[PDB]
Design a protein around this ligand. Sequence first.
Ligand SMILES: CCCCCCC/C=C/CCCCCC(=O)OC[C@@H](O)CO
Ligand SMILES: CCCCCCC/C=C\CCCCCC(=O)OC[C@@H](O)CO
Ligand SMILES: CCCCCCC/C=C\CCCCCC(=O)OC[C@@H](O)CO
Ligand SMILES: CCCCCCC/C=C\CCCCCC(=O)OC[C@@H](O)CO
Ligand SMILES: CCCCCCC/C=C\CCCCCC(=O)OC[C@@H](O)CO
Ligand SMILES: CCCCCCC/C=C\CCCCCC(=O)OC[C@H](O)CO
Ligand SMILES: CCCCCCC/C=C\CCCCCC(=O)OC[C@H](O)CO
Ligand SMILES: CCCCCCC/C=C\CCCCCC(=O)OC[C@H](O)CO
Ligand SMILES: CCCCCCC/C=C\CCCCCC(=O)OC[C@H](O)CO
Ligand SMILES: CCCCCCC/C=C\CCCCCC(=O)OC[C@H](O)CO
Ligand SMILES: CCCCCCC/C=C\CCCCCC(=O)OC[C@H](O)CO
Ligand SMILES: CCCCCCC/C=C\CCCCCC(=O)OC[C@H](O)CO
Ligand SMILES: CCCCCCC/C=C\CCCCCC(=O)OC[C@H](O)CO
Ligand SMILES: CCCCCCC/C=C\CCCCCC(=O)OC[C@H](O)CO
Ligand SMILES: CCCCCCC/C=C\CCCCCC(=O)OC[C@H](O)CO
Ligand SMILES: CCCCCCC/C=C\CCCCCC(=O)OC[C@H](O)CO
Ligand SMILES: CCCCCCC/C=C\CCCCCC(=O)OC[C@H](O)CO
Ligand SMILES: CCCCCCC/C=C\CCCCCC(=O)OC[C@H](O)CO
Length: 464
Amino acid sequence: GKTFFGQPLGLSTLFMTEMWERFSYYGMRAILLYYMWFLISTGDLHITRATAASIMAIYASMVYLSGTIGGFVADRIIGARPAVFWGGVLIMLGHIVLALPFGASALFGSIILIIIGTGFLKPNVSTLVGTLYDEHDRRRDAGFSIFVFGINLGAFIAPLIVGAAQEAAGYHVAFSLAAIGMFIGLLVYYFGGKKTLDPHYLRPTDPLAPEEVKPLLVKVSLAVAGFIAIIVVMNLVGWNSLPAYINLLTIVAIAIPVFYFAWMISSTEHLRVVSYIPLFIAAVLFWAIEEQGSVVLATFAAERVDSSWFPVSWFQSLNPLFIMLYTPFFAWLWTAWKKNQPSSPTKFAVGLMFAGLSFLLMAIPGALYGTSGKVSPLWLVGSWALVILGEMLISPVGLSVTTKLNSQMMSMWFLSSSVGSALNAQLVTLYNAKSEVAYFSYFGLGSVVLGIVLVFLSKRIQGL
Ligand SMILES: CCCCCCC/C=C/CCCCCC(=O)OC[C@@H](O)CO
Ligand SMILES: CCCCCCC/C=C\CCCCCC(=O)OC[C@@H](O)CO
Ligand SMILES: CCCCCCC/C=C\CCCCCC(=O)OC[C@@H](O)CO
Ligand SMILES: CCCCCCC/C=C\CCCCCC(=O)OC[C@@H](O)CO
Ligand SMILES: CCCCCCC/C=C\CCCCCC(=O)OC[C@@H](O)CO
Ligand SMILES: CCCCCCC/C=C\CCCCCC(=O)OC[C@H](O)CO
Ligand SMILES: CCCCCCC/C=C\CCCCCC(=O)OC[C@H](O)CO
Ligand SMILES: CCCCCCC/C=C\CCCCCC(=O)OC[C@H](O)CO
Ligand SMILES: CCCCCCC/C=C\CCCCCC(=O)OC[C@H](O)CO
Ligand SMILES: CCCCCCC/C=C\CCCCCC(=O)OC[C@H](O)CO
Ligand SMILES: CCCCCCC/C=C\CCCCCC(=O)OC[C@H](O)CO
Ligand SMILES: CCCCCCC/C=C\CCCCCC(=O)OC[C@H](O)CO
Ligand SMILES: CCCCCCC/C=C\CCCCCC(=O)OC[C@H](O)CO
Ligand SMILES: CCCCCCC/C=C\CCCCCC(=O)OC[C@H](O)CO
Ligand SMILES: CCCCCCC/C=C\CCCCCC(=O)OC[C@H](O)CO
Ligand SMILES: CCCCCCC/C=C\CCCCCC(=O)OC[C@H](O)CO
Ligand SMILES: CCCCCCC/C=C\CCCCCC(=O)OC[C@H](O)CO
Ligand SMILES: CCCCCCC/C=C\CCCCCC(=O)OC[C@H](O)CO
């Protein structure tokens, strides 16, 4: 009878929950770099703009990493429904912290809250969407597509609204709007969830057995102790600047898949695991370029574009806009393309090439016009158009090609975005007006080349 776009009514609740959470997240992301610039300009924040860019990237890296952990905590300890609720509460607090009359001193607390909160909420709302359907329900894929539409919608409207609020009423009010966005999500989630969600998910579905508690405690304790020890040694040898800590986090984020790879390669489907390395690197490099949209392209938007008549943060709406515009087209495409549809490794290769082209495009205005003036907003429009085209090729088959090639390596796909952002934490420090053309050219061309490399390797990989 009555449905939400053909789906169970409970999808409306989760749709709105994620829409408003993504609203809060991308609303914050769209103005946070500019906020740090402001704090730097007033002498409140004693870092370079390069470091501010680095912060944005490592922030994203840790958000993605945290998301690979939240599912475990919900499934084994607190339950998916409380994970979403309390995750949302932490996220809201994270935005409230930036709305308070503080300056740079509140940045770290806000970042930590949102990292933990998003880690709790993001994997677990997706889990709850699954719970709406039986195993044999063929509506499942349609339901997730609608859910993703809500995600992109929140991501789309947030820079517009939060960016406009920032211009009108300042950063603290704008950040409060992000907080209010999460609050709306929590309201709908809490009261809507009670109506449609299975009570089963109020509790962990795979609770720790009695003998499992101590080994988990030891595991967590040793990890924390090791991490703290590393920080201690860092401060003793004088490696205690902010870039030093960012480097530590970069190393951690990259070492986790590296250790996974070394583990699987050591421990004869050995060929498959090795075959995934080029795909994983391609994913990492793609996500690096895609995630630079809120950092390097955001910098370009503010410094190099004729945008005096609208909030420059609005450029961040282009990424989810193009995802929304492309999605129904590629949905039709992969069904219509019956004969000789490209393999998943081929999609990765071409996807990386489009990401490469998105940067090669951005090298053109500086090379043609110089880098001291300002250029058309359409250069950025074209860039996002290209990189998102790449996303349509690599993202829908990413988890698929990883699974078909089990629980540890599955997480590596989600880790690719974390690793890409960790790489960005290093790379974006190289971007400035002087290096602009070389930056876009070099990393653009590199991605295209590595895409061409993957094309040659596509035949061998598809067989495994
Ligand atoms: C076939 C569907 C593919 C959709 C993606 C295509 C996007 C391609 C974009 C490349 C051209 C955009 C850059 C052009 C540009 O900057 O012109 C500036 C000039 O108009 C200044 O007024
Ligand atoms: C300023 C930095 C603070 C760092 C964040 C501190 C808070 C960290 C974790 C709090 C989240 C705990 C969520 C679990 C909870 O409260 O209920 C779970 C349980 O009741 C469900 O069965
Ligand atoms: C310091 C400012 C933030 C203080 C947070 C106070 C409100 C926190 C979360 C709002 C959640 C909205 C859903 C309302 C709710 O869950 O109330 C539950 C109540 O009816 C019985 O559990
Ligand atoms: C996990 C995959 C890792 C692959 C990373 C590929 C790129 C890694 C390091 C490149 C650093 C050197 C870039 C130096 C550079 O050309 O900067 C350009 C600009 O600053 C002036 O040319
Ligand atoms: C299958 C659809 C997507 C295919 C993408 C086709 C891409 C083909 C060629 C890309 C040309 C790359 C140009 C490299 C370049 O101009 O670098 C010059 C600059 O680095 C000077 O230092
Ligand atoms: C459990 C996996 C997630 C790991 C969470 C640890 C995240 C720790 C730090 C996040 C990165 C933030 C670094 C930038 C930063 O701290 O800015 C603070 C301001 O510079 C204050 O001067
Ligand atoms: C630190 C300030 C935050 C205060 C939050 C309000 C606390 C009052 C009640 C908490 C209710 C916790 C409900 C957890 C939960 O699983 O919600 C799920 C809903 O049942 C819908 O799935
Ligand atoms: C029941 C708790 C749920 C609360 C939802 C989040 C509320 C967030 C902000 C409320 C309004 C905060 C206004 C911020 C503000 O005063 O800006 C100060 C200006 O900078 C002063 O010029
Ligand atoms: C890094 C922040 C998140 C850290 C969460 C890891 C928690 C640390 C050790 C595991 C202890 C979890 C509590 C055990 C529990 O509640 O389950 C009890 C068993 O189900 C009873 O047999
Ligand atoms: C410094 C952080 C390193 C990790 C230490 C975190 C310790 C946090 C919680 C440990 C709680 C001890 C586990 C015992 C427990 O939870 O029993 C609960 C059961 O439900 C009782 O039947
Ligand atoms: C439950 C929260 C526990 C904290 C999460 C663990 C990660 C903690 C720190 C990671 C390193 C980030 C330090 C950033 C920072 O503020 O350094 C600034 C230095 O004072 C440089 O002068
Ligand atoms: C399973 C992941 C475990 C991997 C963690 C291993 C971390 C090992 C070493 C971290 C060293 C931190 C680097 C500090 C650094 O980059 O130099 C400091 C600045 O460059 C100079 O101030
Ligand atoms: C009605 C257009 C489709 C919906 C656009 C949503 C808003 C997304 C981005 C707005 C900021 C970037 C657009 C700037 C722009 O396109 O300017 C083009 C003109 O040629 C300006 O010179
Ligand atoms: C229903 C799927 C088919 C929809 C067709 C999508 C094509 C829409 C826009 C393509 C924009 C192409 C940009 C043209 C261009 O690059 O012109 C460059 C000139 O040199 C600028 O002066
Ligand atoms: C289906 C895509 C077909 C190919 C798309 C266009 C490929 C991109 C560029 C092709 C022409 C390359 C010209 C490069 C070029 O002239 O650079 C100028 C010099 O580097 C300036 O010093
Ligand atoms: C399929 C559409 C692709 C549209 C983008 C194609 C871009 C192809 C080549 C652009 C490379 C421009 C590099 C310019 C350059 O490096 O010259 C340096 C100048 O002398 C200034 O440093
Ligand atoms: C199937 C996806 C491929 C889409 C490629 C369509 C774009 C084709 C050509 C766009 C090349 C970008 C360079 C445009 C350019 O430099 O023109 C100069 C501007 O007119 C400056 O006023
Ligand atoms: C797949 C169905 C949806 C297709 C979306 C079409 C978007 C594709 C490309 C948008 C790139 C915008 C560049 C606009 C442009 O270069 O025009 C230049 C002007 O003609 C010169 O003033």
